[PDB]
Paper text:
Drug efflux pumps play important roles in intrinsic or acquired drug resistance to a wide variety of currently available antimicrobial agents. [name]-[name] is a RND-based tripartite efflux pump, comprised of the outer membrane protein [name], the periplasmic membrane fusion protein AcrA, and the inner membrane transporter [name], which cycles through three different conformational states during the drug transport process: access (L), binding (T) and extrusion (O). A small peptide, [name], has been identified that modifies the activity of [name]. In this study, we report the near-atomic resolution cryoEM structures of the [name]-[name] pump captured in both resting and drug transport states.
The crystallographic studies of [name] in complex with natural substrates reveal asymmetric structures, which suggest consecutive steps of a transport cycle. The crystal structure of [name] in the presence of puromycin at 3.2 Å shows that the [name] subunits adopt three distinct conformational states as seen in our cryoEM structure in the presence of this drug. Poorly defined density for puromycin is found in the binding pocket of the T protomer.
Author numbering:
A (entry chain D): 11 to 166
B (entry chain H): 1 to 37
C (entry chain B): 1 to 1033
D (entry chain A): 101 to 250
E (entry chain A): 301 to 350
F (entry chain C): 51 to 100
G (entry chain C): 851 to 900
């Protein structure tokens, strides 16, 4: 990337909606990455900056970009309980059964943190409920181990 | 000790020069205070 | 009393002799230091947890220690940082006046009892407890110029062959090594380890077993068999001493009977303990020694002794090794000393020239030349006897008192001379008559000056400790001065002055002095004629006086304040900050570019650059550095463009161009503890367990609002570091248990390989040194390297780490702070131009009150002192002001006449303010002590005029105007004599450049400006004051 | 101040010979009067917190700062701070062939705060771009997490 | 002095208490000292008037 | 069970190297012996507060 | 003795050394003080010398 993509990476993390707007209108690379492979979309998804997720995607941000360990912004959004951002990403074609290098899917991540709504959304958009991680564990396996009876019920 | 020779000289030159200025000033400040009366 | 010693010149000469002996002795035994102790006592607890992360250090060490700092005595506050290099620093700051020794032992003892609660690995490293200090006498750099030694090699040489000798050198109190002795480094290779079904655990186990001390016992030990002959001591296993022996450590015997030795799965070498800091000096590998002055020691002698000890080590240095001296305050202190003696001596010569000019006979000229040095010497005797030191502050206190000392000598002698010319009295009875006129005033003056200057000793904290260097120097000088004036100068006048014929005022002399005399008698008539006219129309001048006072207040309120002027100390630092996650190698390229600029574009000015990669002031880490620039001596950098401030600005501008790094030069604070006058130090606090994310967000909320009052707040910013990426690795317990792989083998495999582990000690050439295991760099660099490390299962199979772990990136903190044991975030900032810090602070508090539920704040450091010791100031001007008046009321036996003196105050202040405002100086402490000597001396002049006038009215029945005119007539000459000598004597300071000119400029310009206006204006206005006050009452 | 330094100098010679369990509970050496100066009481006027809750709030948010105050010799909590309490059932332990020793071993291994070092750590290889802390086990923070120990 | 400093420190925490918590003062030995001392002060003043 | 030279190199030197800069120290002496025992003695200026 | 071998006096012998080094300075200052006191009592420079 370039100087503007470094500015964008920072603006996306700090949630400077206005700076993002300007940088969009000066062609800052939306696919600039830091050392671990995080794009501005990864960052906005992690720290929960919805408007910037929307802006970024309207400017051609690869919604299914993955970091050096294979995680996508949908993984991050679902894990950290950012429901809108999860919906926005899915509506823009985010791969719902994406696996990171460990075989972990966004449904898995949300189930572990007990984000029930997000788990329902993910399922709605066709999350594979039987997805196994590298240890052969399902979202269901996770809810029982975690003793979440509510989530265990949904998965059933 | 160039410095001690050097200090001596400035001092003897400076005693008249600065003296005139403070005497000049009171004579002059006196005359203004007479006009301002 | 003066009469007693007029008839006892020998008794007065005995006293004088004593005093010079006492003073002379003091001159030899007085400590010499750049500055006295200023900052309140602090103790620092420091620990390392190798390979730990900020939160682990916090949650297993910092919190444990802070929770045990109970029952300690006199604690003002406590603070801590835990950072991602595995380091914690806890600082406890104690009330001013607390015994630092006792404070340190109470902290150390509470720590001792917490030690069993800290991790084994942290207990093994130790937790150091020390007195906080950042004041080095000098930093000795040691470098290698022929490329045959690494800085790892140099540090060991320094540690093994130099540090101990410097530590034992006379006067040095502490020595820090800027490196570390060798350690035995075992660099592991995961592929070889797996080849032989071994792990870091096996290596650790083997080293602990084959490098150890084993107790045995004795032959013929008690109780013995009767008849035993020989008694000897059994030596069994002792520690290894050499890489060769470590390599021979037996790790495993294969089934075919072959042996696996440590050297078959590990590289072995002597190396450093730490690879965090890479120090270069003009590009060459370096170590060094940081040396501190002992309590009560003489800096000048110690620096010289250190150089002497280094000198005799020079013949034994390996080739290419060289001593350099990047930092040494001693040359600066030497010039300070010289400048102060030069000043005192020139002052004594000026009084000689002025006495001869006016009195025109050498006998009178000798008297101050004797009295003044007696007072100066006697003052070092008093100073020493409560163990002040010769330091910068006490040294300027002495020159600010010169005016008061000189004036006492001139006043006593001139008055005798005047009396002789006006009455024909013989020197002895004239001295008796003269001393009768002024002895009362001189005592009164002593009380009044003691009421102006004593009060500033009692401020609190750091600025209080500063003011009282000046307060006690000046009060003792002034008290010695009056003693000498009542005992010695009267005796000298009576016995050394020659008679003057009645009526002789020298107008009939020939050549220059007759001319001077006629001219000065004429000038005196003008002045009195003018005063006479002024006194016929007092109203206009009361209005003029109010104008002056208002102009004084206006000027005053405009002049921005600070603490102490910056100097060209012969060095400045430049700070190098890269973004988050930047590596050691990137920082080195920036430091290399910085050093190249200094040795290239500033080739004339720069002697050296000490580039320390990895150590910054706002946090450590791979991504920061400091290049520490040292200059050629002032003598070879003539001109305002080759002084630090100039170089700094140019440097910072040139580096604005470095992209992907924040790089910027700044001068050193005169005294490193004081931060800014303009600035404040704010702590944001988690008071209800909110958690790191929420505290951060509260911080950000506050910083955004601060940024919306640029009218009030500027540079409002965090002091610490921002969250960064880190690697979350989850160990899957179920899979581990199913494979028969123990968590302890997993966790020590990981930590030992990637973080390193201090295993035990060995003995290298008679010195105990550490052993470390760690992976070779190339197998602990990237995530894919995680899967190259294998652990052995209970069933003997080697299991790759990838089989039971999972990993993801997340964000987290590389530096966690606490304040009084609650999580905190420090915020720095300053008042916007034209705003007081009080106002900025008040706004910051306002903004802070609007933050989230649970978030609090506290004021710390410089701002703690500001808050408490501004509380004090008003009550102390009030006590000063009352006692001044009460002393004057007693002097003159009047409740009203004191006002005719006090009104004189602004007359000096206005010229001082003018001089400082025009030269662009500030209201700093040197200016405000000068503002006080000026007030003192003009008050003195007025006290004598009014005393003279009143005595004329009371004793000789003269009318109000008649007495005022006569009094003002009599005091004209001595007032002028004193002003001439003082203004000239302080002139070199005003114009001075070069070393210490900042301070010299601060004391000279304010004093000279004030002396001009106090002199010129006072002689016209106190006769007005006296006349209108007497008329009203 | 010195009676305490002297006493503690001698106590630290005995400290290593005391049971590990005594050491870990912390020995104190204090110089204070034997009578109470004052009792600061703390109650909840809305009845929204039990006695046990109040004593934890008192212990965790107030007591430490008072104990560090100057002139405070001893602070005695009239209550107890919270700990994570594990209440064992002997019948279920026997049913799964476990003892309290197996439980204690599991808690130490799985409620751990581990130093794991760094990627690209120093001394590094040439050309490294990544420097990043490695985070591994951390201390547990709720009953839920203590309960899922395997 | 020590009691005053304790109160000052307690005052710093009250603002962040959870709902309901309230400091009460069931036992303090210092008030009697301050009060008995001030009664002596009163008799000094009164004595001057008398 | 250590021997004079092991004790000296691992205990006595370690302590002595940090006994620098103490206030009013006139001289220091030590012995390290083969029973594994060290005595380091610091003697202070007459009049020093012990 | 060979070069590199030095010596120092310790304990009671250190004090012996010190208490002879000082003595000259203590007779000299004593005599001066006696003389200056005598000059002040008799207000004369000669009776002291006599
Ligand atoms: C970002 O804005 C600022 C503004 C000012 C500062 C200056 C800081 N007060 C200061 O103390 N600065 C420093 C130094 O300028 C000089 N010095 C001399 N030797 C050292 C030395 N080492 C141990 C490596 N380390 C640090 N400083 C040394 O003495 C002082 C401390 O011992 C820093 C940052
Ligand atoms: C010898 C008669 C004149 C009285 C002068 C006394 C000096 C007053 C000093 C003020 C004391 C508080
Ligand atoms: C050094 C002090 C000696 C004291 C002498 C007092 C007697 C002086 C009286 C002269 C008549
Ligand atoms: C150390 C004192 C010097 C004395 C010089 C005085 C010479 C005159 C002596 C006769 C006076 C009675
Ligand atoms: C009542 C006569 C007073 C005599 C004055 C003597 C004072 C001398 C002090 C050194
Ligand atoms: C330092 C000794 C100088 C003594 C001078 C005394 C002169 C005697 C005249 C009475
Ligand atoms: C009679 C002699 C007066 C002594 C003053 C000299 C200063 C020494 C003070 C310790
Ligand atoms: C032996 C210490 C050096 C003292 C000589 C300088 C005195 C300056 C007075 C402030
Ligand atoms: C310290 C100054 C030396 C004193 C000399 C005094 C000259 C007059 C006595 C005859
Ligand atoms: C800090 C003490 C300052 C006192 C100023 C009082 C001025 C009165 C002069 C006559
Ligand atoms: C609080 C410390 C101040 C000590 C200085 C006392 C001043 C005495 C002046 C005669
Ligand atoms: C360091 C505080 C000591 C205060 C005593 C100073 C008295 C001054 C006499 C001139
Ligand atoms: C600090 C000023 C005290 C005021 C006393 C004024 C006297 C009244 C005039 C007789
Ligand atoms: C505390 C200062 C008191 C000033 C006394 C004024 C007396 C008024 C004389 C009429
Ligand atoms: C903040 C303390 C200032 C002390 C010096 C007083 C300045 C005198 C001005 C009249
Ligand atoms: C070591 C003996 C030297 C003595 C010379 C000084 C004698 C004292 C004079 C009073
Ligand atoms: C070493 C200095 C010798 C001084 C001799 C003192 C003799 C004093 C008799 C007046
Ligand atoms: C007759 C005057 C006596 C002076 C004595 C001063 C020395 C003792 C303190
Ligand atoms: C040499 C010091 C003497 C002290 C006063 C007599
Ligand atoms: C050093 C202490 C000197 C005090 C002596 C007063 C006569
Ligand atoms: C006039 C000086 C007397 C004080 C001497 C004692 C010094 C102790 C710090
Ligand atoms: C060390 C304090 C000495 C105080 C005496 C001053 C007279
Ligand atoms: C705080 C009271 C001080 C009294 C001086 C007027
Ligand atoms: C302080 C009393 C003043 C009245 C005139």
């Amino acid at each position: 990337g370039s100087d503007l993509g470094k500015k964008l990476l920072e603006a996306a993390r700090a949630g400077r909606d206005d700076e993002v707007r300007i940088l969009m209108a000066n062609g800052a690379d939306v696919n600039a990455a830091d050392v671990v492979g995080w794009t501005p979309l990864h960052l906005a998804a992690y720290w929960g900056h919805l408007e910037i997720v929307e802006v970024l995607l309207k400017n051609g941000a690869d919604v299914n970009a993955y970091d050096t360990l294979g995680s996508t912004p949908l993984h991050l959004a679902a894990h950290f309980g950012h429901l809108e951002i999860v919906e926005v990403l899915l509506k823009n074609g985010a791969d719902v059964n994406a696996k990171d290098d460990n075989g972990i899917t966004p449904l898995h991540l949300a189930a572990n943190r007990g984000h029930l709504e997000i788990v329902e959304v993910l399922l709605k958009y066709g999350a594979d409920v039987n997805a196994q991680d590298k240890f052969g564990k399902t979202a269901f396996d996770i809810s029982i181990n975690n003793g979440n009876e509510d989530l265990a019920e949904i998965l059933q | 000790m160039l410095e001690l020779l050097k200090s001596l000289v400035f001092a003897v030159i400076m005693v008249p020069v600065v003296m005139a200025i403070i005497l000049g000033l009171i004579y002059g400040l006196g005359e203004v205070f007479n006009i301002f009366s | 009393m003066p009469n007693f010693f007029i008839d006892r010149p020998i008794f007065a000469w005995v006293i004088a002799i004593i005093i010079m002996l006492a003073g002379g002795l003091a001159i030899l035994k007085l400590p010499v230091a750049q500055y006295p102790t200023i900052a309140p006592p602090a103790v620092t607890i420091s620990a390392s947890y190798p390979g730990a992360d900020a939160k682990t250090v916090q949650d297993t060490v910092t919190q444990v220690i802070e929770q045990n700092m109970n029952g300690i005595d006199n604690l003002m506050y406590m603070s801590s940082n835990s950072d991602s290099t595995g380091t914690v620093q806890i600082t406890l700051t104690f009330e001013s006046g607390t015994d630092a020794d006792i404070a340190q032992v109470q902290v150390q003892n509470k720590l001792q009892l917490a030690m069993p609660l800290l991790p084994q690995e942290v207990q093994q490293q130790g937790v150091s407890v020390e007195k906080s200090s950042s004041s080095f006498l000098m930093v000795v750099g040691v470098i290698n110029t022929d490329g045959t030694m690494t800085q790892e090699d140099i540090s060991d040489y320094v540690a093994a062959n130099m540090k101990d000798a410097i530590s034992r050198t006379s006067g040095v109190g502490d020595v820090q090594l800027f490196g570390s002795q060798y350690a035995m480094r075992i660099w592991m290779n995961p592929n070889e380890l797996n080849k032989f079904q071994l792990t870091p655990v096996d290596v650790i186990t083997a080293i602990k077993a084959q490098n150890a001390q084993v107790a045995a016992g004795q032959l013929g030990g008690t109780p013995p068999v009767k008849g035993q002959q020989l008694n000897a001591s059994i030596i069994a296993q002792t520690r290894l001493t050499s890489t060769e022996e470590f390599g021979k450590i037996l790790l495993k015997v294969n089934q075919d009977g072959s042996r696996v030795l440590l050297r078959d799965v590990a590289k072995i070498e002597l190396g450093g303990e730490n690879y965090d800091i890479i120090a270069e000096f003009n590009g060459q590998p370096a170590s060094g020694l940081g040396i501190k002055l002992a309590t009560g020691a003489n800096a000048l002698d110690t620096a010289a002794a250190i150089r002497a000890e280094l000198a005799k080590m020079e013949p034994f240095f390996p080739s290419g090794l060289k001593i350099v001296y990047p930092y040494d305050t001693t040359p600066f202190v030497k010039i300070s000393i010289h400048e102060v003696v030069k000043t005192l001596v020139e002052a004594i010569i000026l009084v000689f020239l002025v006495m001869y000019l006016f009195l025109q006979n050498f006998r009178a000229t000798l008297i101050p030349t004797i009295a003044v040095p007696v007072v100066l010497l006697g003052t070092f005797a008093v100073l020493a006897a409560f163990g002040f030191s010769i330091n910068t502050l006490t040294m300027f206190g002495m020159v600010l008192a010169i005016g008061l000392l000189v004036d006492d000598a001139i006043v006593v002698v001139e008055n005798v001379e005047r009396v002789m010319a006006e009455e024909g009295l013989p020197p002895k009875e004239a001295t008796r008559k003269s001393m009768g006129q002024i002895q009362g005033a001189l005592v009164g003056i002593a009380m009044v000056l003691s009421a102006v200057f004593v009060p500033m000793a009692f401020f609190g904290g750091s600025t209080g400790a500063i003011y009282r260097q000046f307060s006690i120097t000046i009060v003792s000088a002034m008290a010695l001065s009056v003693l000498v004036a009542l005992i010695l100068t009267p005796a000298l006048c009576a016995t050394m002055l020659k008679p003057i014929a009645k009526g002789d005022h020298g107008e009939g002399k020939k050549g220059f002095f007759g001319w001077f005399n006629r001219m000065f008698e004429k000038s005196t008539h003008h002045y009195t004629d003018s005063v006479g006219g002024i006194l016929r129309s007092t109203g206009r001048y009361l209005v003029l006086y109010l104008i002056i006072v208002v102009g004084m207040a206006y000027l005053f309120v405009r002049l921005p304040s600070s603490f102490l002027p910056d100097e060209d100390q012969g060095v400045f630092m430049t700070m190098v900050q890269l973004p988050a996650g930047a590596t050691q190698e990137r920082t080195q390229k920036v430091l290399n570019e910085v050093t190249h600029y200094y040795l290239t574009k500033e080739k004339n000015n720069v002697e050296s650059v000490f580039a320390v990669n990895g150590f910054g002031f706002a946090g450590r880490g791979q991504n920061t550095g400091i290049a520490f620039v040292s200059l050629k001596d002032w003598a070879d950098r003539p001109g305002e463009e080759n002084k630090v401030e100039a170089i700094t600005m140019r440097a910072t501008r040139a580096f604005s161009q470095i992209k992907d790094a924040m790089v910027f030069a700044f001068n050193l604070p005169a005294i490193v503890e004081l931060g800014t006058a303009t600035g404040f130090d704010f702590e944001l606090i988690d008071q209800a367990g909110l958690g790191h994310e929420k505290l951060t967000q509260a911080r950000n909320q506050l910083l955004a609002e601060a940024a919306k009052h640029p009218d009030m707040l500027t540079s409002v910013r965090p002091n610490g570091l921002e969250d960064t990426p880190q690697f979350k690795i989850d160990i899957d317990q179920e899979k581990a248990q199913a494979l028969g792989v123990s968590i302890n083998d997993i966790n020590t495999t990981l930590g030992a390989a990637w973080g390193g582990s201090y295993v035990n000690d060995f003995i290298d050439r008679g010195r105990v040194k550490k052993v470390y295991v760690m992976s070779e760099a190339k197998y602990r660099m990237l995530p894919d390297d995680i899967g190259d490390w294998y652990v052995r299962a209970a069933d003997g199979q080697m299991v790759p780490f990838s089989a039971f772990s999972s990993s993801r990136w997340e964000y987290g903190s590389p530096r966690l702070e606490r304040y009084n044991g609650l999580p905190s975030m420090e915020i720095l900032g300053q008042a916007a131009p034209g705003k007081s810090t009080g106002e900025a602070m008040e706004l910051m508090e306002q903004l802070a009150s609007k933050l989230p539920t649970g978030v609090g704040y506290d004021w710390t450091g410089m701002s703690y002192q500001e808050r408490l010791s501004g509380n004090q100031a008003p009550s102390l001007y009030a006590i000063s002001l009352i006692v001044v008046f009460l002393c004057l009321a007693a002097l003159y036996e009047s409740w009203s006449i004191p006002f005719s003196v006090m009104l004189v105050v602004p007359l000096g202040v206005i010229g001082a303010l003018l001089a400082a405002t025009f030269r662009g100086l500030t209201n700093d402490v040197y200016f405000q002590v000068g503002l006080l000597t000026t007030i003192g001396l003009s008050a003195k002049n007025a006290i004598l005029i009014v005393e003279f006038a009143k005595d004329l009215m009371d004793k000789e029945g003269k009318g109000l105007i008649e007495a005022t005119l006569d009094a003002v007539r009599m005091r004209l000459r001595p007032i002028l004599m004193t002003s001439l000598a003082f203004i000239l004597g302080v002139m070199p300071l005003v114009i001075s450049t070069g070393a210490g000119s900042g301070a010299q400029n601060a004391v000279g310009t304010g004093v000279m400006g004030g002396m001009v206006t106090a002199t010129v204006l006072a002689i016209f206005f106190v006769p007005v004051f006296f006349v209108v006050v007497r008329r009203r009452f």
